Design an enzyme around this catalytic site. Structure first.
Site, PDB file in Angstrom:
ATOM      1  NE  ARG A  63      -1.522  -3.130   3.294  1.00 23.89           N
ATOM      2  CZ  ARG A  63      -2.524  -3.054   4.184  1.00 23.89           C
ATOM      3  NH1 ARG A  63      -2.966  -1.893   4.678  1.00 23.89           N
ATOM      4  NH2 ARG A  63      -3.096  -4.184   4.602  1.00 23.89           N
ATOM      5  N   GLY A  64       0.506   2.313  -0.347  1.00 23.24           N
ATOM      6  CA  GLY A  64       1.360   3.470  -0.413  1.00 23.24           C
ATOM      7  C   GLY A  64       1.795   3.762  -1.817  1.00 23.24           C
ATOM      8  CB  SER A  65       3.065   6.823  -3.343  1.00 20.15           C
ATOM      9  OG  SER A  65       2.462   7.459  -2.235  1.00 20.15           O
ATOM     10  CG  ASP A 170       1.344  14.803  -0.313  1.00 17.85           C
ATOM     11  OD1 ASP A 170       0.647  15.510  -1.073  1.00 17.85           O
ATOM     12  OD2 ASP A 170       1.737  13.656  -0.607  1.00 17.85           O
TER      13      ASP A 170
HETATM   14  C1  LIG Z   1       1.649   6.963  12.280  1.00 15.24           C
HETATM   15  N1  LIG Z   1       2.361   7.024  11.041  1.00 15.24           N
HETATM   16  C2  LIG Z   1       1.817   7.521   9.889  1.00 15.24           C
HETATM   17  O1  LIG Z   1       0.700   7.967   9.706  1.00 15.24           O
HETATM   18  C3  LIG Z   1       2.866   7.413   8.832  1.00 15.24           C
HETATM   19  O2  LIG Z   1       3.294   8.678   8.488  1.00 15.24           O
HETATM   20  C4  LIG Z   1       2.421   6.721   7.640  1.00 15.24           C
HETATM   21  C5  LIG Z   1       1.997   6.253   6.625  1.00 15.24           C
HETATM   22  C6  LIG Z   1       1.471   5.676   5.454  1.00 15.24           C
HETATM   23  C7  LIG Z   1       2.014   5.926   4.225  1.00 15.24           C
HETATM   24  C8  LIG Z   1       1.459   5.337   3.119  1.00 15.24           C
HETATM   25  C9  LIG Z   1       0.383   4.494   3.250  1.00 15.24           C
HETATM   26  C10 LIG Z   1      -0.150   4.252   4.499  1.00 15.24           C
HETATM   27  N2  LIG Z   1      -1.220   3.378   4.728  1.00 15.24           N
HETATM   28  N3  LIG Z   1      -1.259   2.761   5.914  1.00 15.24           N
HETATM   29  C11 LIG Z   1      -2.315   1.966   5.868  1.00 15.24           C
HETATM   30  C12 LIG Z   1      -2.582   1.192   7.026  1.00 15.24           C
HETATM   31  N4  LIG Z   1      -2.300   1.887   8.164  1.00 15.24           N
HETATM   32  O3  LIG Z   1      -2.983   0.049   6.978  1.00 15.24           O
HETATM   33  C13 LIG Z   1      -2.984   2.063   4.629  1.00 15.24           C
HETATM   34  C14 LIG Z   1      -4.098   1.494   4.051  1.00 15.24           C
HETATM   35  C15 LIG Z   1      -4.370   1.914   2.774  1.00 15.24           C
HETATM   36  C16 LIG Z   1      -3.564   2.837   2.164  1.00 15.24           C
HETATM   37  N5  LIG Z   1      -2.488   3.410   2.685  1.00 15.24           N
HETATM   38  C17 LIG Z   1      -2.247   2.982   3.917  1.00 15.24           C
HETATM   39  C18 LIG Z   1       0.400   4.852   5.607  1.00 15.24           C
HETATM   40  C19 LIG Z   1       4.011   6.742   9.462  1.00 15.24           C
HETATM   41  C20 LIG Z   1       4.790   7.515  10.481  1.00 15.24           C
HETATM   42  C21 LIG Z   1       3.695   6.576  10.903  1.00 15.24           C
END
Ligand SMILES: CN1C(=O)[C@](O)(C#Cc2cccc(-n3nc(C(N)=O)c4cccnc43)c2)[C@H]2C[C@H]21
EC number: 2.7.11.25
Length: 321
Positions: A63-65, A170
């Site tokens: 997941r993530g970019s 962002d």
């Molecule tokens: C606390 N903390 C942050 O917030 C944080 O910057 C982050 C992040 C981040 C970056 C990209 C994607 C996602 N990402 N995470 C989930 C999930 N949590 O399952 C998810 C599900 C779908 C899509 N993208 C998802 C999370 C990291 C310092 C820590």
């Protein structure tokens, strides 16, 4: 005085600790050391190591970019959460500071951070609903009430961050994570966060998404919490139209600065206060642009004006513009 001595105690080990210890040890990161903030992720013999004490869920689904975020399980405790892989040489302390000790339902919780070789592996709650970005693709685009509902919750989180002098940096659909039933939204991806004191384009800086980027940022003018508001409105438009601002018409940083704000893209069937709210958040000058508190109140009223939240979380697909 003693601050130097506490950093040394945290270095070299992975320990059960508290957010203030994580923040001070993390400033050094900017061999297997770190701090875990919950008992659900416990180190073993001063260590917490990938594939030994923690296991990525199989098969690897990213997941993530950059495909950096993964489901994972603490081998000892069986607890499951997410982990974000950050390259150590480009790690930014503000990412953790901007979520460490912060306790807000509109912000994803930080469970810990542990360096291991070239990686900073950052732990955090797993949200099953997926991202607002994934939602927009699934549904095509969201109805007016759902969009207002989510936009307000993002603004609630931006209030929290801004009070603490924290720019998110962002803001966009991909950085808003939803609960398994869709009724709660949280902000994520603080990799571009920036501590403030009551501009951006100088050296060791990585900026946010082009389409959601505010004019001041583009033209190198000085910047403050208001850029999150511009982005959040570009996110609102993305929610309503099923595509990013400016992409259906245009080298995109040129047009943000010279053209008027994208108010034209505000859909016409939207009620007057929805459109009016979006516009106060798309004022090119930071001074005239609405604050977080202000917009959140407007968006809330706009929702009330349209009958509140009525559309189901996942209704029918709706073709974009
Ligand atoms: C606390 N903390 C942050 O917030 C944080 O910057 C982050 C992040 C981040 C970056 C990209 C994607 C996602 N990402 N995470 C989930 C999930 N949590 O399952 C998810 C599900 C779908 C899509 N993208 C998802 C999370 C990291 C310092 C820590």
């Amino acid at each position: 005085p003693v601050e130097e001595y506490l950093v040394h105690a945290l270095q070299g080990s992975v320990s059960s600790g508290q957010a203030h210890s994580l923040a001070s040890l993390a400033k050094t990161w900017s061999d297997n050391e770190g701090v875990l903030l919950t008992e659900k992720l416990k180190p073993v013999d001063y260590e917490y190591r990938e594939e030994v004490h923690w296991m990525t869920h199989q098969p690897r689904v990213g997941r993530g970019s950059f495909g950096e975020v993964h489901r994972m399980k603490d081998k000892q405790t069986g607890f499951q959460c997410a982990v974000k892989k950050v390259r150590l040489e480009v790690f930014r302390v503000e990412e953790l500071v901007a979520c460490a000790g912060l306790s807000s339902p509109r912000i994803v919780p930080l469970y810990g951070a542990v360096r291991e070789g070239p990686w900073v592996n950052i732990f955090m709650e797993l949200l099953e609903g997926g991202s607002l970005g994934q939602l927009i693709k699934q549904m095509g685009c969201l109805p007016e009430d759902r969009a207002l509902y989510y936009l307000g919750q993002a603004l609630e989180g931006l209030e929290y961050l801004h009070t603490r002098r924290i720019l998110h940096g962002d803001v966009k659909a991909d950085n808003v994570l939803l609960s398994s039933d869709g009724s709660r939204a949280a902000l994520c991806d603080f990799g571009h966060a920036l501590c403030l004191q009551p501009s951006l384009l100088t050296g060791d800086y990585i900026p946010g998404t082009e389409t959601h980027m505010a004019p001041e940022v583009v033209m190198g003018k000085p910047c403050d919490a208001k850029v999150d508001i511009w982005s959040s409105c570009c996110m609102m438009l993305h929610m309503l139209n099923g595509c990013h601002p400016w992409t259906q018409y245009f080298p995109l940083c040129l047009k943000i600065a010279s053209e008027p704000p994208p108010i034209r893209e505000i859909p016409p069937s939207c009620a007057p206060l929805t459109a009016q709210a979006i516009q106060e958040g798309l004022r090119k000058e930071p001074v005239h642009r609405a604050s977080a508190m202000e917009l959140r109140r407007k968006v809330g009223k706009a929702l009330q004006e349209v009958g509140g939240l009525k559309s189901p979380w996942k209704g029918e697909y709706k073709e974009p513009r």
